[PDB]
Amino acid sequence: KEKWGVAHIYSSYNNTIIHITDLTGAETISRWSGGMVVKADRDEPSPYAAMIAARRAAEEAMEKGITGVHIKVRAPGGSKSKSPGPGAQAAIRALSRAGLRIGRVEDVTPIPHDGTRPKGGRRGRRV
RNA sequence: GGAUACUGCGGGCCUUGGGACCGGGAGAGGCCGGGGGUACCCCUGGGGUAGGGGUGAAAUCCUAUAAUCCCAGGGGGACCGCC
């Protein structure tokens, strides 16, 4: 019988996290990061590491009995950036290739209607 | 001693400058009260297991007393996106 889950994709400028849950999101099936498939800090946000982590999570989910996946993609947001990193699309392509069927795609980045003051000071970063 | 155009002084008149009033409308003008909206931080439970964060590259830092992540709830302070 068809079994559906959700895939949360947290993508920042420094790392990517692919986390598969049931539909309620209350039960975890497979959670992989880009800091487990490489060992150099400067390559965790790589679309390659994203592809790899997504492939492994999809393998485990399939073995556990999950055939379909809805997607929820997420930049950090809030007072931080609202644009996702370069790993989300690669992760989605990897999820599709691994054999999982894909359903609805949605963006669930949090946006303030208005928000706590952001960290850089009045001037911002200068280097 | 003479004159009366201009200024001044005294008395009347006028409505153009200014003030008052009526009407239907515009506006993030100000004060008071009431009701909310997301997002952020902490606490309490359920899941899951080894990294998370950060940089030009790193390290201090957090994390097996179970972090990052997802779910259900409770509390708090500031501000009010797009249009």
From Swiss-Prot:
Pfam families: Ribosomal_S11. PANTHER family: 40S RIBOSOMAL PROTEIN S14/30S RIBOSOMAL PROTEIN S11. The keyword Ribonucleoprotein applies. It comes from Thermococcus kodakarensis (strain ATCC BAA-918 / JCM 12380 / KOD1). This is Small ribosomal subunit protein uS11. GO terms for molecular function: rRNA binding; structural constituent of ribosome. One of its GO terms (cellular component) is cytosolic small ribosomal subunit. NCBIfam families: arch_S11P, PRK09607.1. Residues 103-127 are annotated as: Disordered. PROSITE patterns: RIBOSOMAL_S11. Located on the platform of the 30S subunit. One of its GO terms (biological process) is translation. Part of the 30S ribosomal subunit. Belongs to the universal ribosomal protein uS11 family. Keywords: Ribonucleoprotein, Ribosomal protein, RNA-binding, rRNA-binding.
